[PDB]
Ligand binder design. Structure first.
Ligand SMILES: Nc1nc(SCCCN2CCCCC2)nc2sc3c(c12)CCCCC3
Ligand SMILES: Nc1nc(SCCCN2CCCCC2)nc2sc3c(c12)CCCCC3
Ligand SMILES: Nc1nc(SCCCN2CCCCC2)nc2sc3c(c12)CCCCC3
Ligand SMILES: Nc1nc(SCCCN2CCCCC2)nc2sc3c(c12)CCCCC3
Ligand SMILES: [Cl-]
Ligand SMILES: [Cl-]
Ligand SMILES: [Cl-]
Ligand SMILES: [Cl-]
Ligand code: NA
Ligand code: NA
Ligand code: NA
Ligand code: NA
Lengths: 396, 396, 396, 396
């Protein structure tokens, strides 16, 4: 049982583990496009001797954080252990090796999407964004008088084929991802992938349509089996006008009973309607998970709330260092100290605070975050809070 | 069609409308206990001529708001129009008369629980609290190492019969309701009611049990039909230790597969577990709705966040007045002005901001709240935000 | 195995067979009220030796037929064979004995409600009325401009308790049953029974409410388990105005999603709505079954369509006689003949034609009704057709 | 927003609206075969400026009406408004333009199949045929002694592949459609379409089989997911013998639990069985909708019942003219008058009466049809009634 970087001979055996480990496996044709995002020495395999019984890799990503700051981010993916090799500490050995390489490479944070919620906490990953499915019964949906874009004359929104308006989607997404915490750069090869999934599959998904505004788009398709449900796969809106305009078009899908979308907890859609209760939360789950690789680099890189007045404290991350933390004028200075800790937390808890999805007060109440000063707790809450609500970009 | 205060002759006819309008009607035996909370001239009936074709009333309540401030609150309830008299503007006439009496009586706010989400917005009520159902698959549930009360020696929690420990529940609730925004005073007659529902009913609900801590309780019963589901009807915890201790006991119900509870979005329970994903949000909805009766009285009565620095603005409520609003040191001064408005909103939107459940930024994005100053929006957000998360007390 | 009229000693043993044979058995308390409708020698029991292993009886009923003519009718009911005695020709022996007594007593027709659709055809019973369940999604339901009772001012309909308005229901029903084919006289003891079922049962049915017009009523209750469904148990309307008025009230039940009713195929309700498709047929089945005991007496008693011109024919009922049938001026003369048959049918087929529910053309196409003259078929169709659509009164 | 006849440049944009508006869209390959049935100037498009935001067309059809009379019929289809352009009166403008062209072209009637039951009533369309789904549990099904084709010797019915017996299906259908009200001429291109859908699709429908008699056929396939259900897509029988013979073969499908078919309310199938209750009505809905374009032309073209004696009246269609109507010897004469109206109805109500599906008495009871003479109502009922029951041909 040896842990190595895979050669080109190892990949056929990795795809077999992938096929047997992930249901959604789209096969080696689209594996070619995701492979370009893996750097040299981005991948580890465990061989028994011989076959592949374990793999993990990371991809080079660009993650937007509060203050419209863009961090180089190691995206962990394709993590699998063979059903023949469970409870052998392969995951722990592979994660330990990639984290070593990620840190040495100079990535301040790593990120992943979790197949289960009970695995990644112990390797220092905290859930950092919340997926929030809204299902609108669009037969009852009436827009509030206050709602934008209810005036006479033409609609700004067009119904289009995705593949004929690639340039415009790219441009709108690029604007979106730079202004929103949780935003990821989407490279050309993932746009090739996205627009390939937009066409109908034999005995599979139905054809995707697009609603296009100057400052937003919505990709959607009718459900395979439930022909009265439209699923919005992706809605990117740069302005409140574009968001409302796009939803007026989606509520216009008069052959549908229900529109569902996976969005964020602060989606304004419910407030656009006369009955806020028509936008039912049907599903909630963790989205992006964050491991803070370099605590000082990460805390200094993001912006903080300007409303909270300047304050200093000593933060201890369990096995992650102890730091004098000074926050004022929406910037942080984070420097080594041996002074007594005022705040203690595990590294995963910091990940969960970092994009403003979770409040320090909430984590404190569960004793995940320890301090003996309630004032300092209120000040952390306010500082780490994100002006622009955190959203989830795309699964990787 | 005449609108009057009901005499004792009108009540038999009101109960018939209640029976035909509300399914959960427990009949006139428990109507005697809710009737004590209705003041003289708290009720209006519409007669056709003759029978009752419309009714509405309010009850005298005490609602806790941010800053542990307790407001006299008109609780609207028992609102019904006969199926024979729809679309006749009876609701609008009854609401207009009660609001007149509520205002003249000197209540700064009114509140209700909504049977539908599309009715009460137009009479100035805004959803102010969020109900959040968590369903825990307790077969997988393991408490995090950080979680309080995992040490050796005795449990602090006892399994008891509710009716034998009334005094202790009352005391714990009284402590809870005074420290939590959304808290309501529960008078003796509603404790009589609650402990009567605690016993098993023939072909109805099963027997309620209680878990009792010094600083918290949980009332729960097994589901009528699903015998592997335990429903927590009510969990009141004054300390984080009590909350964790009570949940360790509930996760100890080893004959159950699932524990469900209707709680608030900031419930720390998910963070007490090694797998946060085991506490699934199964249901979300509006809880308490708030109509601000006197804008200056209400805005001046509540506490604000100490973290935001002193700031002044001019708020206009549509048909509710225009005010110079000055917030600093967690207090507000709200005085008449004819100066140009900086913020505009309908009266319902103010209700939704008032207990900190909804962010001004969110409502602004839906154009329910208008300003041309993003800095002022950030400052409102921060100020109106509640240190202690808003919870829902009991339905009325 | 001996077939006899039961003595008062036999009844305890009949109730046990009833309990074991019919689920809906309400027990001997309400068996006292149905027993009054059984004449002396109206009942047969089969004893093994000793216990009751078979029973059947008939009740004295008054059935309205086309031409507002009221026939004395033997109502077959309480028909059961013990599970220990199947395939022993007990049903055939009991039916043969009661039919003998019914004929000798001078009843022109017998009737029953069938537990299965494959039993009673061979004893000469034909399905004569059609039950037709309409389920209205009342959230979408809007009344057509043409619909009666949409004007300003008071409603004619009142929401009442059934038991407080017995006299008025009785009177309206009595008017209804005399003008509608399928109508049955409802004696005092069955009104006692109906108004006893109107009150709520512990772990059973919910409380029944009534909508009362001068010329119609609707009894309804909310479903045990589905709390958004209202079931209309009984709607009697003497005028089109009363029918529309009552449905405007039922569509006013704003807490309900769906109203269901068991009605007849020609119910005008769908045409009262802007969308006829909102009144979905959810269920269809045979209602009342008819055995013509005396062919000439029955054919001469009912009225026929005045529109068809006078015509003569020879009808043969298989083992029921052969008759010269002359129909003109909406009356029939039916006299013995040995002349060649022009029409042949089994006795059950005549039952199915007799109230106008089924067309001779339809039964002819299935070769249940034989003739070599298509003109005669058209003339039978037209003659037997009922001006007033046939309805089902109550189950017995 | 301009309304025009589409050029060949407009069609790509029409197919995109079709794809986004109709789920069942089979794509432009089969759009080529339906396009041949659209005359020059049979189509209208609405452009925004530019893209297609609205379309509607009509096809040249031949509809059989009572008296085996065949009318030229404008078949409205492919009617869609873009979700971006709702509530802009595009449907009303397109329907107004096509109705103008249809009338000027000299079509006496137009017809459509409705996607919802609440749209087309206001443009003068009445539901004229009833779809009636029967589901037979064929494990219990035993044919009555009276049923044709139960004798010894060979079956007349053969199990065949559809595509190998096109000529014979065509011939039988052609005979069927000329003798049945609701019948449509099926042109060669729709037989090409029907026999292309008869073969199995990858991850789609299973292979269609045919039962072939000299005087009837039944096309059927096993359900995609429910492998114990056979769906009869189409059963055409010219004689009662052929209908019974085909059903004896379908009840012979011994691997199936259930046979379902969409048929008409007067289908004799239930009467072919010993238990009529085995043929359960599972579904009912409106089929073909009829707009009478020229009232006199339409009323004079159809045959009437010979049984009703000669009678005269004055019919007023709301905004459709007023006519002296004289019916006798199964023919109508319909001429202009200013004499006082005896009958009044909207144009949609006439459509609903025209093929005999709905009775004037039923529509009168809902006040859709006004007269102060009950005798005249009985005479209309009898006259408009169809000897041959009305069936639905194929959806367009
Ligand atoms: N990284 C890749 N992603 C995808 S699509 C998103 C899947 C959802 N997840 C399912 C399990 C939990 C995490 C999210 N496809 C592919 S294919 C492929 C990789 C990859 C990883 C890079 C190496 C080349 C092979
Ligand atoms: N006010 C009362 N409450 C209750 S229990 C909570 C019901 C849930 N709601 C269901 C509908 C929406 C609002 C909440 N029971 C009673 S009984 C009664 C009153 C009353 C109102 C006071 C007048 C005496 C009669
Ligand atoms: N005749 C009676 N009816 C009823 S209620 C309707 C039952 C539905 N059926 C269920 C099975 C198929 C027929 C209809 N209850 C009773 S109780 C009783 C009799 C009786 C029959 C008369 C003799 C006294 C005992
Ligand atoms: N007219 C056409 N029909 C069909 S198949 C029946 C569909 C069911 N409906 C679904 C919605 C309600 C009405 C019935 N396919 C096509 S494809 C096509 C047309 C068309 C209309 C003619 C213009 C060429 C394009
Ligand atoms: Cl999102
Ligand atoms: Cl709560
Ligand atoms: Cl009925
Ligand atoms: Cl059909
Ligand atoms: Na809005
Ligand atoms: Na914890
Ligand atoms: Na009407
Ligand atoms: Na037959």
């Amino acid at each position: 049982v040896t842990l190595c970087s895979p050669t080109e001979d190892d990949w056929p055996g990795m795809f077999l583990l992938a096929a047997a480990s992930f249901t959604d496996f789209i096969g080696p044709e689209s594996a070619t496009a995701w492979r370009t995002l893996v750097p040299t020495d981005g991948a580890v395999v465990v061989r028994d001797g011989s076959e592949v019984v374990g793999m993990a890799l990371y991809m080079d990503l660009r993650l937007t954080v509060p203050g419209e700051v863009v961090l180089p981010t190691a995206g962990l993916s394709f993590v699998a252990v063979a059903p023949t090799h469970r409870r052998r500490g392969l995951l722990r050995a592979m994660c330990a090796e990639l984290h070593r390489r990620i840190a040495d490479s100079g990535y301040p944070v790593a990120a992943l999407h979790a197949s289960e919620g009970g695995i990644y906490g112990r390797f220092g990953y905290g859930p950092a964004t919340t997926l929030h499915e809204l299902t609108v019964d669009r037969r009852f949906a009436r827009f509030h008088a206050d709602a934008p874009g209810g005036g006479l004359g033409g609609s700004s929104v067009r119904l289009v084929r995705p593949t004929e308006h690639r340039g415009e989607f790219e441009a709108i997404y690029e604007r979106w991802r730079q202004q929103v915490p949780g935003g990821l750069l989407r490279p050309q090869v993932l746009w090739d992938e996205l627009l390939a999934e937009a066409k109908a599959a034999p005995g599979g998904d139905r054809e995707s349509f697009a609603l296009l505004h100057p400052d937003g788009y919505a990709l959607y398709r009718v459900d395979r089996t439930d022909l009265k449900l439209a699923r919005v796969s992706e809605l990117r809106a740069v302005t409140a006008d574009a968001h409302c305009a796009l939803w007026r078009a989606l509520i216009g899908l008069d052959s549908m009973e229900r529109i569902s979308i996976i969005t964020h907890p602060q989606d304004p859609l419910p407030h656009l309607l006369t009955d806020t209760r028509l936008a039912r939360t049907t599903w909630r789950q963790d989205g992006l998970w964050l491991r803070i690789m370099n605590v000082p680099a990460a805390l200094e890189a993001r912006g903080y709330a300007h409303e909270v007045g300047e304050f200093s404290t000593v933060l201890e991350v369990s096995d992650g260092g102890r730091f004098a933390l000074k926050i004022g004028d929406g910037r942080a200075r984070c420097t080594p100290t041996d002074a007594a800790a005022e705040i203690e937390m595990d590294r995963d808890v910091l990940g969960s605070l970092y994009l403003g999805a979770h409040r320090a007060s909430t984590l404190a109440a569960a004793n995940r975050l320890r301090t003996k000063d309630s004032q300092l707790l209120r000040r952390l809450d306010a500082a780490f809070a994100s002006d622009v609500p955190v959203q989830t970009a795309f699964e990787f």
